[PDB]
Design a protein around this ligand. Structure first.
Ligand SMILES: *[C@@H]1O[C@H](CO[C@@H]2O[C@@H](C)[C@@H](O)[C@@H](O)[C@@H]2O)[C@@H](O[C@@H]2O[C@H](CO)[C@@H](O)[C@H](O)[C@H]2NC(C)=O)[C@H](O)[C@H]1NC(C)=O
Ligand SMILES: *[C@@H]1O[C@H](CO)[C@@H](O[C@@H]2O[C@H](CO)[C@@H](O)[C@H](O)[C@H]2NC(C)=O)[C@H](O)[C@H]1NC(C)=O
Ligand SMILES: *[C@@H]1O[C@H](CO)[C@@H](O)[C@H](O)[C@H]1NC(C)=O
Ligand SMILES: *[C@@H]1O[C@H](CO)[C@@H](O)[C@H](O)[C@H]1NC(C)=O
Ligand SMILES: *[C@@H]1O[C@H](CO)[C@@H](O)[C@H](O)[C@H]1NC(C)=O
Ligand SMILES: *[C@@H]1O[C@H](CO)[C@@H](O)[C@H](O)[C@H]1NC(C)=O
Ligand SMILES: *[C@@H]1O[C@H](CO)[C@@H](O)[C@H](O)[C@H]1NC(C)=O
Ligand SMILES: *[C@@H]1O[C@H](CO)[C@@H](O)[C@H](O)[C@H]1NC(C)=O
Ligand SMILES: *[C@@H]1O[C@H](CO)[C@@H](O)[C@H](O)[C@H]1NC(C)=O
Ligand SMILES: *[C@@H]1O[C@H](CO)[C@@H](O)[C@H](O)[C@H]1NC(C)=O
Lengths: 476, 965
């Protein structure tokens, strides 16, 4: 007999409230082959405690329903009765009670990329889709899932994107071997790493802003670089910690992995302490205040790194992942908010985070998965933090002027003291006037340099501030 | 039933249709629960292993009409709801909840029947299933007791935590650093070699096979360092007792090595007193010579004291040992049979003899008593034992071959024992599980003495003063002992050898129950450590202060011989700070407690009405004294009594029955003859003069005139508790889920709260606020909202909760009262100080309490004729029609006494055609006029917000209607 399978999902769009909803999937009861396919009328009663929340009546061949507007940290009771719709005879009944807990529960869907396409593999229904058909195969794949955007690097070394309902748009073309790829989903910055092929080989971290993309091919900017003779692997962007964490290894010693990173605001180098040298790093929980990392050391064991305490953390999934072997835990490992996925012996295994057990095991073809990625919960800031700030203030700070030119610094703006994260897509626009002489549309982080100014002469700059989201909402 | 019984004539609520639908549905679910109750309560759910409960039942036929069934779980060592489970129609349930590992569980089913909260069934519990062990422990090990024994040692006793999450292996102790692992069977550790007079911090953790648990934190002082007297300033005195020569000696550099007593017979044992200074001498033949001395010389000779044998003593018993209790003034004897050693305690006269323990064949070498810590110790050649003074509990400390003479320090709690066969130092604690070595200087001494950090070892010619690290060949001072052959007993004559002072005390858990001019206060005694017994004495006098914050004046009263104190003569409506300490016999008091803000009641005859579970009713004051047993007899389990006038009261019992009682004259006064079933609560409007109750079977509110018994159904649905504001006529009601307001118009209906469930509420009409209790999952959460900012005032956690409909508002104090569900306590929370929860105990004549009310000092006001609508004049009801389609009825407008808003309800009868209107003007337009000259019947019901006037019924002839368009 086929049981009622309910999964809660928490879907968060930027400038919108997170919505937590319950997806119910129930298979049909077994019918004879002489009888045709029958309509099953599914009656659901959702209960909060002793009161009734929602009630839906659906004519479906198999139950695929969605209860909206659930609240976190509360026990719900879904009572489903299945009748045959033509006759009224009761096919079955089910009663699922569910504490919600959206940080440990999600829908088991992965994004898999072979040489032909990028698809979604739902591990419950064992069904495969195709989101985008690729002419050339995918080497690295990250995503922004508030707007369902896929960002990937092809074999011809080009960085591309996909929104549903359009063509694959070309974002960048670069001329070296890309070692790793990451995205900050809040500020819409794509970071990657390129191989530098001098005789001490290095890797340079390039960034691109998605708010500056209007349909033509952009070019990346060098932000940081590693020390010479060392190389990068497995770039993970932590936006709420404002960090960029990679595995820095030395060329010739790939099993000496050390957890290195940069700080995303001021560019300062940061170090994280491990008890053993590493081979592989994967992204973790990505929840604010409880960010983890799944990281594999040189003996093929895993720690769940808590990055605030900077320590390994014991869990019940750790021995079950270490029983699979080194090649399975080092090749493909992904983690969303609800599950944790590994590939071993042409089969994808999903381990639940709440129950700490093996939940799903789905067999594959020998070339169906080359890259695995998960729908991890990208926690967005609130609506005052993402948008343009109300108060103007003295954001423009004058430096020490020479007689010929002044180096006006353009810093990066947070909206209030309640918003610790930077505002996405910040563009200053400046007139220069003699207290126009010059017009600039310039982003945050760089400086304006202000040549051909007269000595012993007052000057004025005036500017409006714009963000990506105030252009999207058409706010003034 | 509101949507099923929807009619276009009686709108918006066809009230008897809704009441008949709701009463038929509760009768249906009552008959279904009475049908399936035996099959639920016989059938046990079975567990199998995802974890799966199989219950031998089925879902009901109207399965979606009922509430959700709940699987409930219980720890084996209350029932909480399981959150994650998956059941099909044959109850083959799969638990998806992350259970606590290595915890045994029991599971059961809860089947509700409809929306009624009374009709639940509980299945029997499962056989007990333990979760398999995995992971680190999540519970810190809670320490029981943690104290400094002396300046160098530290003792801790603990128990394991609740969720061990595995089989227990070892506990880790960290002292700040000193770390130590101890195995699973031991739960007591004593450290050593600590610094004197600093506090240490102890960190205790639990270790199983998988990992290490959380860390328990402790702050604990050692004892301060004793003053070290040198050899030049040693002012002590010793009494060395040999078998044939007893000599008292001064430990000065100019010491007198002076004879006190010579006995030619060999003495078996001595007993030494401190205030009396008496050396009892028991010889080898068994006769006792009581010998009083004074400061090392004779003041009285030896007297032969005869012990009574009695009917306990059947055979011959020859005494050998002696020990003298300095608290009880009683001796303890070990006796020899001429065939076993049995120890009999006796008085100083020797007549009141009673045995302790059982007889054993081993010979007792020394009997010593800790009278302060309540222990008698007997040492034999096989073991050292420990007994309490009443002989209740028996313990053996250490087994060893042939131990020597041990010395008990009471305030160090360490037995120091010296085998002459070993020649090395041994420290035993009072539980006997701690055995420790120390360095000893080499010589074999039969006895010793301990003086601070110094050690006195008697030689055959001299005495050796060492500090247990310097050599015995070079003592710091020497005193000659040349007339003594051997030294079996050395007694140090200090007051610290036999102290009456326990040297530890700090009272706690101070509780003050306050009145207008008095206060009853109780504090907990400081608890006993495991090192002393139940026969240990800590007889104290407690000193209590009242600090007035108005005058900032501290008054202290001392010599209170018990933990309870009835303090009198307080000025009313005043706040103080009350603090207690414990003073010993020696006059060294304890530390201060934390003060509590203790506000008195205001001045007035403030009487509380208590009602039992047996129907007895008593009137106390606010302290619970001054009781008057009232004349009337209530029924079983009554609720709070609602008074209409001063003779007639109404109450609800525990089974939902509503009862009227006339207190003064019982032959008349109640308009309803029988009790009425299924009633939630009851209240009364004095201004309208109407009794409002919730009929739970009709989920309605019934309003009754108390002078006539005429009942009106009123459209408030699913309500349990009512309170009506008499100023505006607004009814305030609380459901199980929500709390809200009903007015005369639908615009005045406002919802204050939606959720556990609301247990009781109370309305504050004067200050325009409202309070309610939410009885959640083990936490009573009290709230406050204005009548036009919702905050949680106080959350009380625990398994004890409130009686439903038991929150009253103490107006003079400005507090909230609720009776607890056990019926032996009430809790009171003031509004100015939210954090203090005083408890009122219940008087013992009505020992389970079911109701507590604050009686008002003023009488209840009479009914108001200013809210009664006047009757509509039947001559003034005119059917005057205008031009076009304006065919309307008007009347003279009904007023009230005070000028209140009078609305109208109107009924038209065109024969069999019916039309109802709800009106706010003296005016009604008739629409579907039948034009053929009928006799219209018009009935008018005027009303106000509080009550309704009489019905005016007229019959009018229709005017002729010629156009039909
Ligand atoms: C779910 O379906 C039932 C049954 O649908 C009928 O039978 C199917 C095999 C198919 O042929 C359908 O088109 C038929 O309607 C619905 O019940 C019917 O509902 C309509 C609308 O109220 C009513 O007139 C009919 O009498 C009903 N028929 C029976 C046999 O009960 C039902 O309403 C559907 N549920 C929903 C939410 O649409
Ligand atoms: C309190 O009110 C009640 C009415 O609710 C009064 O009871 C009536 O008393 C008279 C005189 O004894 C009887 O004839 C009536 O039958 C009673 N009324 C009913 C409805 O039964 C009672 O007298 C009042 N008490 C006082 C002191 O006023
Ligand atoms: C969430 O709800 C909003 C409306 O409040 C809706 O616009 C958005 O598409 C929803 N996202 C989903 C599908 O979860
Ligand atoms: C691994 O790298 C660390 C950090 O640079 C270094 O100290 C160590 O020697 C390396 N170990 C080996 C075996 O190369
Ligand atoms: C990154 O920089 C910001 C701004 O100075 C600072 O608050 C933050 O602590 C830095 N982050 C880390 C992880 O050090
Ligand atoms: C691994 O996969 C192959 C595919 O044919 C199969 O034969 C084999 O049994 C698998 N091994 C295990 C341990 O499942
Ligand atoms: C001039 O402009 C560039 C481009 O932003 C900037 O990097 C640089 O710091 C400026 N200032 C100098 C050279 O002082
Ligand atoms: C700069 O000046 C031009 C000319 O008036 C104007 O179009 C433009 O909007 C100005 N920029 C800003 C930020 O005001
Ligand atoms: C130990 O000293 C600290 C330092 O202030 C203090 O907090 C604590 O109360 C002391 N502990 C005891 C048991 O006296
Ligand atoms: C009510 O109205 C009447 C008529 O206007 C008036 O005389 C009277 O003062 C009003 N107030 C009261 C309290 O009766």
């Amino acid at each position: 007999p086929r049981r009622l399978r309910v999964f809660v999902e928490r879907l968060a769009t930027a400038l919108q409230e997170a919505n937590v909803s319950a997806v119910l999937r129930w298979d049909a009861p077994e019918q004879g082959q002489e009888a045709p396919m029958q309509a099953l009328e599914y009656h659901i009663s959702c209960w909060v405690g002793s009161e009734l929340h929602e009630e839906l009546r659906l004519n479906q061949s198999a139950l695929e329903a969605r209860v909206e507007h659930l609240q976190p940290d509360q026990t719900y009771h879904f009572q489903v009765e299945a009748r045959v719709a033509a006759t009224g005879a009761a096919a079955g009944a089910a009663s699922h009670a569910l504490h919600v807990a959206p940080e440990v529960q999600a829908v088991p869907r992965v994004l898999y990329a072979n040489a032909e396409f990028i698809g979604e593999l739902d591990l419950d229904t064992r069904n495969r889709r195709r989101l985008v058909h690729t002419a050339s195969p995918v080497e690295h794949l990250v995503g922004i899932e508030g707007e369902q955007r896929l960002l990937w690097v092809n074999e011809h070394v080009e960085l591309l994107t996909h929104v549903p309902g359009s063509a694959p748009a070309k974002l960048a073309r670069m001329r070296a071997e890309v070692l790793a790829l990451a995205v900050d989903w809040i500020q819409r910055i794509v970071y990657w790493a390129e191989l530098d092929a001098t005789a001490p080989q290095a890797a340079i971290i390039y960034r691109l802003d998605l708010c500056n993309f209007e349909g033509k091919i952009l070019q990346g900017e060098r932000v940081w670089s590693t020390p010479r003779g060392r190389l990068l692997k497995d770039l993970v962007a932590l936006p709420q910690a404002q960090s960029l964490i990679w595995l820095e290894y030395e060329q010739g010693s790939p099993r000496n992995g050390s957890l290195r990173g940069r700080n995303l605001t001021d560019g300062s180098e940061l170090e994280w302490a491990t008890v053993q040298p590493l081979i592989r790093l994967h992204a973790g929980s990505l929840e604010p205040g409880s960010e983890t990392l799944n990281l594999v050391d040189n003996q093929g064991k895993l720690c769940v790194y808590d990055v605030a305490r900077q320590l390994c953390t014991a869990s019940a999934l750790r021995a079950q992942l270490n029983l699979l072997g080194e090649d399975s835990i080092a090749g493909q490992l992904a983690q969303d908010s609800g599950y944790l996925y590994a590939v071993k012996n042409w089969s994808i295994r999903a381990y639940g985070r709440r129950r700490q057990q093996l939940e799903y095991t789905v067999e594959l073809e020998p070339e169906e998965v080359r890259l695995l990625q998960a729908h991890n919960y990208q926690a967005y800031p609130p609506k005052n933090c993402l948008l343009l700030p109300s108060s103007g203030g003295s954001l423009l700070k004058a430096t020490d002027c020479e007689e010929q030119r002044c180096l006006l610094n353009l810093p990066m703006i947070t909206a209030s003291e309640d918003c610790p994260l930077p505002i996405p897509g910040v563009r200053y626009q400046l007139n220069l006037t003699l207290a126009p002489l010059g017009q600039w549309l310039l982003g945050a982080g760089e400086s304006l340099n202000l040549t051909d100014l007269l000595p012993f002469t007052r000057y004025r700059v005036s500017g409006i501030l714009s963000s990506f989201y105030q252009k999207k909402l058409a706010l003034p | 039933c509101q949507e099923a019984c929807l009619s276009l004539q009686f709108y918006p609520y066809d009230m008897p249709c809704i009441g008949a639908c709701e009463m038929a549905q509760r009768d249906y679910w009552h008959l279904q629960r009475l049908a399936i109750s035996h099959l639920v309560e016989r059938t046990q759910p079975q567990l199998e292993r995802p974890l799966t409960i199989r219950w031998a039942m089925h879902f009901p036929e109207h399965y979606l009409a009922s509430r959700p069934f709940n699987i409930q779980y219980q720890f084996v060592d209350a029932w909480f709801n399981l959150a994650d489970y998956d059941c099909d129609e044959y109850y083959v349930c799969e638990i998806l909840e992350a259970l606590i590992p290595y915890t045994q569980y029991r599971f059961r089913f809860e089947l509700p029947f409809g929306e009624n909260r009374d009709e639940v069934l509980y299945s029997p519990a499962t056989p007990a299933y333990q979760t398999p062990p995995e992971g680190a422990p999540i519970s810190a090990p809670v320490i029981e007791h943690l104290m400094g024994l002396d300046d160098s040692h530290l003792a801790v006793h603990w128990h394991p935590g609740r969720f061990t999450n595995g089989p227990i292996e070892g506990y880790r102790l960290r002292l700040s650093t000193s770390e130590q692992l101890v195995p699973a069977g031991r739960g007591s550790y004593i450290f050593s070699q600590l610094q004197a007079g600093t506090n240490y911090t102890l960190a205790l953790s639990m270790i199983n096979k998988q990992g290490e648990g959380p860390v328990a934190k402790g702050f604990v002082q050692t004892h301060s360092a004793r003053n070290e007297k040198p050899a030049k300033d040693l002012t002590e005195s010793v009494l060395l007792v040999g078998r044939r020569a007893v000599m008292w000696q001064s430990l000065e550099p100019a010491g007198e090595n002076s004879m006190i007593y010579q006995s030619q017979e060999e003495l078996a044992d001595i007993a030494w007193s401190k205030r009396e200074q008496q050396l009892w001498l028991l010889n080898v033949h068994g006769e006792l010579r009581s010998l009083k001395f004074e400061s090392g010389q004779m003041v009285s000779p030896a007297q032969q004291l005869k012990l009574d044998l009695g009917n306990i003593s059947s055979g011959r018993w020859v005494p050998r040992r002696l020990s003298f209790d300095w608290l009880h003034h009683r001796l303890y004897f070990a006796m020899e049979s001429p065939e076993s050693f049995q120890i009999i305690s006796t008085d100083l006269l020797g007549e009141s003899a009673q045995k302790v323990g059982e007889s054993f064949d081993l010979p007792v070498e020394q009997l010593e008593v800790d009278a302060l810590n309540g222990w008698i110790f007997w040492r034999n050649e096989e073991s050292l034992w420990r007994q309490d003074l009443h002989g209740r509990m028996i313990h053996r400390l250490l087994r060893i071959r042939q131990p020597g003479w041990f010395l008990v320090q009471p305030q160090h709690f360490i037995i120091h024992l010296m085998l002459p066969q070993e020649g090395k130092f041994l420290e035993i604690s009072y539980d006997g599980g701690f055995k420790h070595p120390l360095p000893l200087p080499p010589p074999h001494w039969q006895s010793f003495a301990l003086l601070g950090r110094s050690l006195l070892l008697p030689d055959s010619g001299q005495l050796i003063l060492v500090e247990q690290q310097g050599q015995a060949a070079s003592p710091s001072a020497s005193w000659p002992l040349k007339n003594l052959p051997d030294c079996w007993a050395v007694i140090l004559l200090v007051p610290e050898s036999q102290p009456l002072t326990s040297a530890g005390g700090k009272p706690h858990s101070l509780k003050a129950l306050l009145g207008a001019q008095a206060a009853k206060i109780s504090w907990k005694e400081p608890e006993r450590n495991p090192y002393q017994s139940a026969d240990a004495a800590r007889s104290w006098s407690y000193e209590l202060e009242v600090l007035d914050v108005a005058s900032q004046s501290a008054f202290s009263i001392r010599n209170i011989r018990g933990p309870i104190f009835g303090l009198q003569r307080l000025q009313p409506d005043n706040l103080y700070q009350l603090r207690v300490r414990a003073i010993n016999v020696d006059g060294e008091p304890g530390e201060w407690t934390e003060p509590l803000a203790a506000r008195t009641w205001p001045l007035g005859p403030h009487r509380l009405r208590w009602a039992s579970r047996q129907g007895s009713v008593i009137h106390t004051n606010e302290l619970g004294e001054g009781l008057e047993v009232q004349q009337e007899q209530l029924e079983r389990l009554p609720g709070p009594m609602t008074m209409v006038n001063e003779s007639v009261g109404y109450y609800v019992t525990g089974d939902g029955l509503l009862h009227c009682i006339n207190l003064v004259h019982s032959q008349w006064g109640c308009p309803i003859s029988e009790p009425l079933q299924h009633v939630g609560s009851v209240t009364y409007d004095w201004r309208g003069g109407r009794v409002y109750w919730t009929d739970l079977a009709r989920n309605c509110v019934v309003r009754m005139d108390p002078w006539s018994g005429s009942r009106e159904l009123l459209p408030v649905f699913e309500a349990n508790f009512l309170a009506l504001d008499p100023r505006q006529g607004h009814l305030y009601y609380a459901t199980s889920s929500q709390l809200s307001r009903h007015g005369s118009t639908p615009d005045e209906a406002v919802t204050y709260y939606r959720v556990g469930s609301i247990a009781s509420f109370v309305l504050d009409t004067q200050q325009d606020q409202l309070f309610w209790l939410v009885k959640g999952s083990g936490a009573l959460r009290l709230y406050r909202a204005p009548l036009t900012s919702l905050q949680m005032i106080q959350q009380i956690k625990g398994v004890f909760q409130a009686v439903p409909d038991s929150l009253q508002l103490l107006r003079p104090l400005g507090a909230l009262l609720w009776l607890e569900r056990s019926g032996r306590r009430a809790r009171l929370v003031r509004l100015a100080a939210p954090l203090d929860v005083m408890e009122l105990p219940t008087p013992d004549q009505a020992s389970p309490a079911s109701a507590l009310q604050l009686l008002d000092p003023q009488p209840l006001p009479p009914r108001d004729e200013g809210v009664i609508p006047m009757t509509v004049l039947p001559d003034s009801v005119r059917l005057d029609d205008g031009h076009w389609d304006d065919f309307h009825v008007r009347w003279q407008p009904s007023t009230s006494g005070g000028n209140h808003s009078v609305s109208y309800r109107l009924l038209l009868e065109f024969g069999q055609r019916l039309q109802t209107l709800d009106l706010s003007t003296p005016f009604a337009r008739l629409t579907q006029l039948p034009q053929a000259q009928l006799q219209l019947k018009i009935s008018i019901t005027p009303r106000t917000a509080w009550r309704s006037g009489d019905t005016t019924r007229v019959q009018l002839t229709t005017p002729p209607v010629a156009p039909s368009q």
